[PDB]
Design a binder for this molecule. Structure first.
Ligand SMILES: Nc1nc2c(ncn2[C@@H]2O[C@H](COP(=O)(O)OP(=O)(O)OP(=O)(O)O)[C@@H](O)[C@H]2O)c(=O)[nH]1
Ligand SMILES: [Mg+2]
Ligand SMILES: [Mg+2]
Length: 331
């Protein structure tokens, strides 16, 4: 398929998505509800938003909201790292347990799950009106990477469509970590999209260190999304260039998808090698360095750490299949 063909099926596939109102207006009430609960634990605690809501400036269906609870001092330390220690984890679980209890008290019909499978303690809430959200505590790095990605998409707002196209597809194909057998989160896919756009000079490099939590909005404003006005030609051209790039230009054997620096990052300069795989264990299991995606803020975090040789196979295959189906749209 030509870029035009892909472009057109892509715009047609989103027609329902651009039908309803996109505004991040809808989050305010939920934000207020959660802050209601947070205040009962501590009226001096802050509530911040992050995740796709912030990255895009729009609120997607089938997407949760991400919240983090922060102390004043956590905010004022707007460029501090997040401790990867057992006591930090314990602090976060202690406060999240208290909050989950309040959420249950105040909302008898909500399911309030204390999720402990994870590196980062999280409370998962499903109320029913797709009132859907995760709450974490005492961490800057989610608000920070989301503000970084948001800053990138503000440079070139129509690029959000390339991104959104990749997110929906990743899930359709079973590539996205949200699906059983999935290996890369949506966050990972966004890192790849941005890295791609940077290599093509569609975006201007933003050093991750310039992002300051003390200067972000707890709840950032809406950023209007408008239909690709050129029939979707730019989108279709981007999608095909994105697939070509990740199939034929990005060298997964030698290179790391990174936003820490402009240009190429090597596996060797990170020590992200077969030798490191023998030593490297995250959350009690092997980290893989077959597909390398460097996290801009957390030390030594491969976002592609679950991409085994097999899942790497599966990704190449899908990247190939994606060309001929316009990201599973020409069916
Ligand atoms: N360290 C790390 N954090 C992640 C990863 N995936 C998601 N997160 C965190 O969670 C936040 C939102 O992640 P996601 O829910 O996967 O991304 P999203 O943009 O909200 O997309 P959807 O919820 O799938 O629509 C990000 O700011 C990340 O900090 C990951 O693979 N590694
Ligand atoms: Mg999310
Ligand atoms: Mg998530």
């Amino acid at each position: 398929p030509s870029p035009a063909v892909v472009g057109r099926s892509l715009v047609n596939s989103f027609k329902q998505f651009v039908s309803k109102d996109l505004h991040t207006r809808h989050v305010d009430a939920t934000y207020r509800l959660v802050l209601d609960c947070v205040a009962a634990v501590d009226p001096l605690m802050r509530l911040y938003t992050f995740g796709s809501t912030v990255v895009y400036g729009v609120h997607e269906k089938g997407s949760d909201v991400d919240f983090v609870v922060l102390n004043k001092t956590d905010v004022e330390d707007g460029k501090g790292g997040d401790a990867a220690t057992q006591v930090a984890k314990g602090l976060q679980a202690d406060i999240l347990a208290k909050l989950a209890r309040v959420i249950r008290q105040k909302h008898l019909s909500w399911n309030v799950e204390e999720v402990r499978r994870t590196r980062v303690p999280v409370v998962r809430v499903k109320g029913g009106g797709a009132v859907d959200f995760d709450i974490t505590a005492y961490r800057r790095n989610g608000v920070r990477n989301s503000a970084l990605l948001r800053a990138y998409f503000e440079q070139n707002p129509p690029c959000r469509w390339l991104s959104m196209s990749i997110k929906r597809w990743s899930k359709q194909t079973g590539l996205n970590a949200s699906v059983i057998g999935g290996s890369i989160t949506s966050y990972g896919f966004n890192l790849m999209v941005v890295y791609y756009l940077l290599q093509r000079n569609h975006l201007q490099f933003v050093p991750p260190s310039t992002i300051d939590v003390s200067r972000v909005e707890p709840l950032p404003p809406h950023l209007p999304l408008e239909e690709p006005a050129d029939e979707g030609l730019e989108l279709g051209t981007q999608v095909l260039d994105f697939l070509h790039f990740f199939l034929h230009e990005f060298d997964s054997d030698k290179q790391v998808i990174s936003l820490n620096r402009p240009g190429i990052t090597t596996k060797e300069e990170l020590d992200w090698t077969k030798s490191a795989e023998d030593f490297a264990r995250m959350n009690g299991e092997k980290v893989h360095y077959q597909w390398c995606i460097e996290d801009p803020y957390e030390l030594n975090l491969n976002v592609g750490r679950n991409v085994t040789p097999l899942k790497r196979d599966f990704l190449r295959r899908h990247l190939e299949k994606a060309r001929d189906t316009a990201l599973l749209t020409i069916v």
